[PDB]
């Protein structure tokens, strides 16, 4: 009989879905075939980036004495980090606002 | 101006024959190379087939 099913995420030690990523790769017309390790690698990378942004955004939410992350905290996390700001340079965050920044010349004497 | 030999009104580089009258580049080169005038049958021509705004 068939052995007990184990998700590929559990085999790879990931929280993100390896199976869904593989299916989306197959259905996206990216290539004729998809390797076994490609969805694992891609899911691991996506999980890492999500964890990075969530860590920074949780820090920003804590700085505001807030318990829940809102778009403002995601914007603050992204634009205060050089790497993420470079990755997401051309992206607009709805309800994210902007970083507070006044040019020094505009301040009073 | 026009070529004294074959009478094309446009050429990439006007030249002059032994008699001093203007000749187009192809006829001048053909004369200087072969010693014979360039045939008008050898001359090519065409008419535009496509146009737009």
């Amino acid at each position: 009989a068939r052995a007990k099913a184990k998700t590929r995420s559990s085999r790879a030690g990931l929280q993100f879905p390896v199976g869904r990523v593989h299916r989306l790769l197959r259905k996206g017309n990216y290539s004729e075939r998809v390797g076994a390790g490609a969805p694992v690698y891609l899911a691991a990378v996506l999980e890492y980036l999500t964890a990075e942004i969530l860590e920074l955004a949780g820090n920003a939410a804590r700085d505001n004495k807030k318990t829940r992350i809102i778009p403002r905290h995601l914007q603050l996390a992204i634009r205060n980090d050089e790497e993420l700001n470079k990755l997401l340079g051309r992206v607009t965050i709805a309800q994210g606002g902007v970083l507070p920044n006044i040019q020094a010349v505009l301040l009073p004497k | 101006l026009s070529c004294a030999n074959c009478q094309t009104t446009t050429t990439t580089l006007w030249r002059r024959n032994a008699e001093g009258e203007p000749v187009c580049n192809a006829c001048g080169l053909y004369m200087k190379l072969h010693g014979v005038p360039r045939p008008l049958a050898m001359r090519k021509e065409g008419i535009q087939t496509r146009k737009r705004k």
């Binding site: 590929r8 085999r11 790879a12 030690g13 990931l14 929280q15 993100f16 879905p17 390896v18 869904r20 990523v21 989306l24 790769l25 996206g28 990216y30 290539s31 004729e32 075939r33 998809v34 390797g35 076994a36 390790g37 490609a38 694992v40 690698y41 891609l42 899911a43 691991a44 990378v45 996506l46 999980e47 890492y48 980036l49 999500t50 964890a51 990075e52 942004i53 969530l54 860590e55 955004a57 949780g58 939410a61 804590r62 318990t67 829940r68 992350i69 809102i70 778009p71 905290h73 995601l74 050089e82 790497e83 993420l84 470079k86 990755l87 997401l88 992206v91 965050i93 709805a94 309800q95 | -």
Partner: protein, 95 residues
């Protein structure tokens, strides 16, 4: 019921609980994170497909994903993501 519409919400929430156990997230923020994951997926997959096409290969392998990550992510993010992906593939290959 309405037609099912899948998303990354549960996985983003699990990662959040892993990183900030006591922090929550609003629905708008979760939508933004879902858009982010879709965007990065499309970027990496498109670059990998172009890499496979340039080399006249039919299959996208983990090497294509690694090269796409190197091309797309900047600086330290690239190497950290490469380490994470290599570690995940090593774990998976051991079954």
């Amino acid at each position: 019921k309405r037609s099912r519409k899948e998303s990354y919400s549960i996985y983003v929430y699990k990662v959040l609980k892993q990183v900030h156990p006591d922090t929550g997230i609003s629905s708008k923020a979760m939508g933004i994170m879902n858009s982010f994951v879709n965007d990065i997926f499309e970027r990496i997959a498109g670059e990998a497909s172009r890499l496979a096409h340039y080399n006249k290969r039919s299959t996208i392998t983990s090497r294509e994903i690694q090269t796409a990550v190197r091309l797309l992510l900047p600086g330290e993010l690239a190497k950290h993501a490469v380490s994470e992906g290599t570690k995940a593939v090593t774990k998976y290959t051991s079954a």
